[PDB]
């Protein structure tokens, strides 16, 4: 072929050479430069016909190579002219010709005339190339233009500019060769953010990029860089906060000219999070640090270094003699924070140290050097065991930089905990010195001269044969000599024996025949905080070893109270999560369980219930599954062990966070039997109730009307097996819709009221007619028979007022596990008895004996009986009677009110600050002994059955604390039943003070008010009675100003008089101001700082958010009025709310209102419509250029209408930025059922795009159905605007955005729905949207 082409195109050249040399011969009337060129390629036309399409590209590549091989520009132009006519006449495809002309390696910018002639030819024929091929040629042409240097000759510019005209032709919107979005995509790929356009192009491509500046705004969240989250390490993570681990930049969709701040690293965002306690999990999720390899993330590594420098800066400037007030608080946080990232190999200690040296070299004074070395000592002392020595040597350069070398550094006052920070430098050197002695030679490390006094003090104290706890001399030795074989048994063993109590007599525990070791004083927190992580690691390991040792020794002596108290305090440090928390549930718990210790196992579960705090959700689910398998088998048929297992599980289930429930239980859909109960109906009901509020608070079902398909169907369907039950109407009506639809079907028949009464009387008649004890015991304790014995005991002491000796033996044979069914049926029987009863003595006799069965005979505990009563399915008056029985049991006798009054008055819930809990614990049990083995029954029986069952260790719990989780459930049942309103007020008056010892009081109020907004909106006094009683129980245990605002304490704390307190705008500004200042970090601070390791919240912002939501829900003001008042804090000109910082306020309002019930945050839809109908969007006064200031809240505005229009868009973005996907699912219907019929102008259409546009990506990832509904709504609005407007001025930004939505999101999903909408648009819109249907 190529030889044929050679002969053909040689004739073309040879024929033109003789025509150039002899003109005017055969040109009498030729065609105007058409037939000549066509006839020249006549031989090539016949040759091209006999070629397959496979040979076409090879033939054109050869022709281009033959034209580019010519030397005469006059001949190249002629051949190009022949080629141009071949494309015009349809003989040659334009794309292949353009591709071959531009890809030619002979085409160089130095070939100054071939360059111009080539691109002049491209300019003629490129118009006939399809839009995808034009995009391909756009890339290579811009690449060839990039090969031209910045300095060239002046004479060749006009010839080089021939390529600029092709770029000008491709970028011509009126030419419409390709979607303009394609063109700006290829331009930004070669000229990204930061690069300057080539001099040959210049203003051409720079102005074309600026035409997509509006589209980038439509797809950007206003003020996103200043939007900050509240750190909750709970359910998954929002994709809005994820960052590029290599650049710290947001992942942006498309190559658009987004604002400059969106291309910058989000240091302020990452810095704010790292400063917060328990941000460890959220920092990993942002940067994708899911533990894959030695990450060595330098942007995180450098940000940790900047956070250390910031702690050094705040170390200066006052802070005075006592404490730090921040600074020492930040160093404390830096201590535990940086350990994780270096331990799991995300930050490198040697690189951090030398990078810290450069940052600290010549940067002013150095006052926080000891705290810096204390932070660094945590890395060295804990990891130098096996890491190479060369990784810790850079510390030597830091020491020489921060300390005075000449004179001795004196020994500090070892009575203060700050001595461990002063000795931290010498401790670091002792670890470096021992790493240099172990495996000697090469490089020995000498101690400095300035640290000679600190070292002599540590060695002279190490040879002291008996060291005390009266100072920190012991902690200094544990910190310094932790990595020494025999030099660590001297200090470590000195503080392990002080809590073990090996000798010096024993001590009793509650009940009978239960003894523990002598020591009761645990190691204080300021001592444990003074220990290094390595020193605490050995303490954790030595305590767990002795427990396992005591567990295998089959010993009946209990662990010392100081041991379990100290071990619970060491379980606080999450930097020791490997040996502490993970080992407690995965190693110590199974080991104790496999050894049949029971006693020790009872201590570990009791320690968990009363001494844990910030446990990760997956760890709680692990313990929960262990509790279920522990209760079902292993024959744990002991009264005290079954009560402990069932009580501990109730706390885990009830305390699960709303956002934590789905991600932890969605993992067990394959086999939900592991995380459920097989016989405890109450626990399974408690889990259903916890699903109810978790799906409610997270708005999980908002949008879906069926539980099927979700994770809840397999959890609930399995719960119907094992423990089938019904739900009363007043409780079922509060569940989310799809949950009710699951319980209306899957309905269980219930034994009627008459059949229970008839069964109890027939069995009590049999009891009075039988004499053989063996027949009585076999019958009334038969497994599988109706559980009526508690009803029988009720019948016995109701008539005869006493119980036979067989009555105790029958209970003893039933067992603790099988007895809950008897309590369950006895609860129903109690309801029938009280519901069908005459008043007077006949009713007061039932109350008298019902208390006797609890307190006199000890047949069932108060919390076991009331939990069963509150977990019944009675309706109407029967339910009123059931709750009336609960009120009687609690308030009528003196047995429980005295226990609660004395326990609250004499005890404090801060166990971590207490050194005498066991004493105050024994004083209660010695005053109100609890009988857990039917002692009262066996003691007052006809021949007193002597009982000697040994009790298991009880270190913390009692009946008052065991009832507090059930009290949470009792309150919810009373709120659901309207006639039982008044009795709930009496409970909170008498027993409300018990919430002093609640573990999550603010969280409980938050869920209660949020879940029961419908039942408390029109009962404000009850809502105030609840909030004031629970928060009021902590007034003497938490600082003033910790929860309720100063205004709420001065106005909403008075009696009602047909004039509730209606807060003004000043109130809501101050209330929101407490959150904006807490998230900003203030040295005084709106709230007092608490040890977040022992609080229900992880950090100040999490605490500031919930107490604000709780207070707003406690107001006697509707959700609509409160929600609008929140929006008016920013959307109306308000003092005390300073502008220039309005995004921090919009961020807080978004966080606050998105956590409130729907009647609160729904008002945003009303506020948008008021802007949609505003004169700024409804007027027809035209602009020149895009009205950026109508949508940019930072620009200057000409009208108040423009100001509120932009502020509304900015606030609507902040609100939707923090909204759950369930709350965002209302937007498609909000667009189609509210905005669609009123959006008629072009500015209204753009305002809708600016509203929803930025959140398209969230619908792409989280709920796809909405993304399509929104996409069609945008086109439906475009057709309405197109039909109501005579003309449209901004059709290019509208179509650019619609193209961006296609290629980035909708793709080809919406094609037929959109195409029919396109066909009714005006032709100007159709030509721009020519490629949308492709």
């Amino acid at each position: 072929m190529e030889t044929q082409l050679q002969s053909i195109f040689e004739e073309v050249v040879k024929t033109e050479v003789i025509e150039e040399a002899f003109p005017g011969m055969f040109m009498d009337t030729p065609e105007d430069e058409k037939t000549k060129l066509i006839s020249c390629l006549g031989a090539f036309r016949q040759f091209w016909g006999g070629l397959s399409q496979e040979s076409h590209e090879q033939c054109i590549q050869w022709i281009v190579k033959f034209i580019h091989g010519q030397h005469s520009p006059k001949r190249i132009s002629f051949l190009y002219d022949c080629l141009a006519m071949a494309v015009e006449t349809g003989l040659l495809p334009p794309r292949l010709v353009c591709e071959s002309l531009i890809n030619s390696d002979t085409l160089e910018w130095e070939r100054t005339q071939l360059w111009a002639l080539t691109f002049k030819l491209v300019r003629k024929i490129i118009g006939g190339v399809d839009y995808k091929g034009v995009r391909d040629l756009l890339k290579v042409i811009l690449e060839k233009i990039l090969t031209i240097p910045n300095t060239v000759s002046s004479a060749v510019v006009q010839q080089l500019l021939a390529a600029r005209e092709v770029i000008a032709y491709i970028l011509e919107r009126n030419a419409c060769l390709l979607p303009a979005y394609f063109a700006v995509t290829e331009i930004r790929k070669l000229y990204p953010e930061g690069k300057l356009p080539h001099w040959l192009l210049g203003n051409l491509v720079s102005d074309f990029v600026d035409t997509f500046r509006p589209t980038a705004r439509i797809n950007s969240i206003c003020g996103r860089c200043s939007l900050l989250p509240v750190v909750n390490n709970s359910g998954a993570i929002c994709n809005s906060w994820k960052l590029d681990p290599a650049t710290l930049r947001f992942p942006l969709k498309g190559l658009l000219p987004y604002d400059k701040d969106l291309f910058e690293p989000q240091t302020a965002l990452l810095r704010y999070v790292l400063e917060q306690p328990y941000s460890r999990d959220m920092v990993c999720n942002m940067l994708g640090l899911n533990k894959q390899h030695k990450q060595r993330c330098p942007v995180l590594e450098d940000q940790l270094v900047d956070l250390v420098v910031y702690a050094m800066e705040r170390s200066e400037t006052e802070e005075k003699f006592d404490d730090g007030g921040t600074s020492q608080l930040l160093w404390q946080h830096l201590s535990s924070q940086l350990i994780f990232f270096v331990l799991f190999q995300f930050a490198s200690f040697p690189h951090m140290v030398l990078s810290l040296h450069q940052k600290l070299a010549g940067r002013g004074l150095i006052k926080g050097r000891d705290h810096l070395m204390w932070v660094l000592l945590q890395f060295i002392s804990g990891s130098i065991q096996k890491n190479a020595l060369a990784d810790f040597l850079p510390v030597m350069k830091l020491f020489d930089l921060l300390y005075p070398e000449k004179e001795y550094i004196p020994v500090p006052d070892i009575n203060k905990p700050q001595s461990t920070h002063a000795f931290a430098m010498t401790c670091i050197w002792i670890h470096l010195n021992r790493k240099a002695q172990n495996d000697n030679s090469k490089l020995q490390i000498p101690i400095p001269h300035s640290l000679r006094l600190h070292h002599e003090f540590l060695q002279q104290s190490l040879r002291n044969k008996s060291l005390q706890m009266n100072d920190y001399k012991i902690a200094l030795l544990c910190n310094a000599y932790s990595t020494n074989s025999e030099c660590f048994t001297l200090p470590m063993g000195a503080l392990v024996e002080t809590i073990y109590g090996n000798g010096i007599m024993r001590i009793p525990l509650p009940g009978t025949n239960c003894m523990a070791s002598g020591s009761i004083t645990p190691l204080p927190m300021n001592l444990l905080d003074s220990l290094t992580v390595h020193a605490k690691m050995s303490l954790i390991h030595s305590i767990a070893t002795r427990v396992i040792k005591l567990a295998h020794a089959k010993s009946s002596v209990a662990l010392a109270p100081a041991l379990v108290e100290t071990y619970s305090r060491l379980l606080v440090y999450m930097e020791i999560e490997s040996l502490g928390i993970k080992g407690f549930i995965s190693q110590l718990l199974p080991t104790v369980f496999k050894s049949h210790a029971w006693g020790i196992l009872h201590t570990l579960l009791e320690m968990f219930s009363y001494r844990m705090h910030h446990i990760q959700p997956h760890y709680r689910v692990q313990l929960l599954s262990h509790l279920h398998t522990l209760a079902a088998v292993a024959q744990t048929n002991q009264n005290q062990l079954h009560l402990c297992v069932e009580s501990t599980a109730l706390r885990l289930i009830t305390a699960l966070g709303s956002s934590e429930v789905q991600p932890q239980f969605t993992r067990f859909l394959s086999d939900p039997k592991t995380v459920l109960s097989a016989e405890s109906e109450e626990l399974n009901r408690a889990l259903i109730l916890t699903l109810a509020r978790a799906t409610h608070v997270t708005d999980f079902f908002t949008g879906s009307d069926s539980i099927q398909g979700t994770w809840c169907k397999d959890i609930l369907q399995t719960i119907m097996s094992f423990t089938p039950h019904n739900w009363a109407s007043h409780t079922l009506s509060c569940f989310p819709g799809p949950l009710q639809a699951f319980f209306k079907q899957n309905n269980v028949p219930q034994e009627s009221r008459f059949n229970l009464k008839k069964n109890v009387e027939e069995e009590y008649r049999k009891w009075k007619s039988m004499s053989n004890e063996n027949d009585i015991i076999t019958h009334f304790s038969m497994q599988g028979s109706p559980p009526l014995f508690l009803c029988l005991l009720w019948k016995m002491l109701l008539e005869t007022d006493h119980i036979n000796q067989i009555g105790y033996r029958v209970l003893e044979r039933i067992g603790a596990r099988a007895l809950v069914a008897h309590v369950r049926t006895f609860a129903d029987f109690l309801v029938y008895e009280f519901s069908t009863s005459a008043g007077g003595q006949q009713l007061n006799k039932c109350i008298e004996i019902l208390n006797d069965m609890v307190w006199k005979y000890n047949i069932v505990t108060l919390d076991r009986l009331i939990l069963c009563l509150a977990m019944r399915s009675h309706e109407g008056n029967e339910a009123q009677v059931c709750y009336f029985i609960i009120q009687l049991l609690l308030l009528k006798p003196n047995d429980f009110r005295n226990r609660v009054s004395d326990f609250v008055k004499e005890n404090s819930p801060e166990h971590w600050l207490q050194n005498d809990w066991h004493t105050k614990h024994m004083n209660y049990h010695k005053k109100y002994p609890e009988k857990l083995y039917f002692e009262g029954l066996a003691e007052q029986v006809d021949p007193p059955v002597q009982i000697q069952s040994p009790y298991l260790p009880i270190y913390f719990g009692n009946v008052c604390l065991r009832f507090l989780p059930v009290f949470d459930i009792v309150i919810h049942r009373f709120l659901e039943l309207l006639p039982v309103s008044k009795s709930l007020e009496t409970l909170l008056d008498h027993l409300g003070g018990l919430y002093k010892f609640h573990d999550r009081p603010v969280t409980y109020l938050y869920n209660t008010l949020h879940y029961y907004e419908m039942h408390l909106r029109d009962r404000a006094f009850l809502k105030r009675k609840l909030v004031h009683a629970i928060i009021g129980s902590l007034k003497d245990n938490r600082p003033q100003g910790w929860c309720l605002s100063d205004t709420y304490l001065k106005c909403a704390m008075n009696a009602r008089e047909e004039n509730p307190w209606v807060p003004d705008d000043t109130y809501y500004c101050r209330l929101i101001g407490r959150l904006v200042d807490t998230m900003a970090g203030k040295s005084p601070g709106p709230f007092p700082n608490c040890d977040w390791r022992f609080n229900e919240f992880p950090n100040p912002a999490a605490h500031a958010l919930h107490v604000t939501c709780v207070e707003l829900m406690a107001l006697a003001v509707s959700g609509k009025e409160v929600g609008n008042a929140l929006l008016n804090v920013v959307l109306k000109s308000q003092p005390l709310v300073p502008r220039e910082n309005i995004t921090a306020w919009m961020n807080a309002i978004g966080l606050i209102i998105t956590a409130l019930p729907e009647p609160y945050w729904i008002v945003l839809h009303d506020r948008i419509v008021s802007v949609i109908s505003s004169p700024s969007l409804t007027s027809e006064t035209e602009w020149v250029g895009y009205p950026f200031r109508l949508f940019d809240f930072t620009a200057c505005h000409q009208s108040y209408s423009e100001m509120s229009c932009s502020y509304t868009l900015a606030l609507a973005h902040a609100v939707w930025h923090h909204s759950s996907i369930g709350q965002l699912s209302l937007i498609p219907k909000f667009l189609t059922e509210v905005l669609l019929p009123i959006v008629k102008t072009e500015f209204q259409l753009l305002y809708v795009y600016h509203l929803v546009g930025p959140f398209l990506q969230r619908f792409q990832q989280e709920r796809t159905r909405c993304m399509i509904e929104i996409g069609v709504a945008f086109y439906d609005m475009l057709l309405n605007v197109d039909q109501c407007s005579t003309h449209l001025n901004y059709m290019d930004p509208i179509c650019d955005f619609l193209y961006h939505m296609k290629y980035m999101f909708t793709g080809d999903s919406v094609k037929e729905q959109v195409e029919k909408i396109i066909c009714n648009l005006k032709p100007a819109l159709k030509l721009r949207l020519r490629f949308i249907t492709h």
Partner: nanobody, 123 residues
Framework: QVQLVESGGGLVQAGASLRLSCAVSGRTGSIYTMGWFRQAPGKEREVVARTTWTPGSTKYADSVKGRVAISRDIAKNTLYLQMNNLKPEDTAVYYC?????????????????WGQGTQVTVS
């Protein structure tokens, strides 16, 4: 607490019109959406028309689509239901209901406050 009192029903011939009114009283401002419902003698209560209170966005059921207009007067605290071209199948007791949730309007959440109703019998 929010009280509602329907009014304006009675016996009307087929094809004629009727203008129901609802006297909204009590704690107005707690109301985000309001609607009209109806219930035949032996059938389940259906929804007729719903409105968002302050903006006035309307939403109509497919059974009465095109024949019915729902409106409100915030100043007079009154909800209106204009029913035109009445058919015999429209014989029912008509209730006005309010609700504080947007999902009452968008979805099918039950309304919270109710009136006793008014009889509309179209022969």
């Amino acid at each position: 607490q929010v009280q509602l009192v329907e009014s304006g029903g009675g016996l009307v011939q087929a094809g004629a019109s009727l203008r129901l009114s609802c006297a909204v009283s009590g704690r107005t401002g707690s109301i985000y959406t309001m609607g009209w419902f109806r219930q035949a003698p032996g059938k389940e209560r259906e929804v007729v028309a719903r409105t968002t209170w302050t903006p006035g966005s309307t939403k109509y059921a497919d059974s009465v689509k095109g024949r019915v207009a729902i409106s409100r007067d915030i100043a007079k605290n009154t909800l209106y239901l204009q029913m035109n071209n009445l058919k015999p199948e429209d014989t029912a007791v008509y209730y006005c209901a309010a609700c504080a949730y947007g999902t009452c309007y968008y979805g099918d959440r039950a309304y919270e406050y109710w009136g006793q109703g008014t009889q509309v019998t179209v022969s």
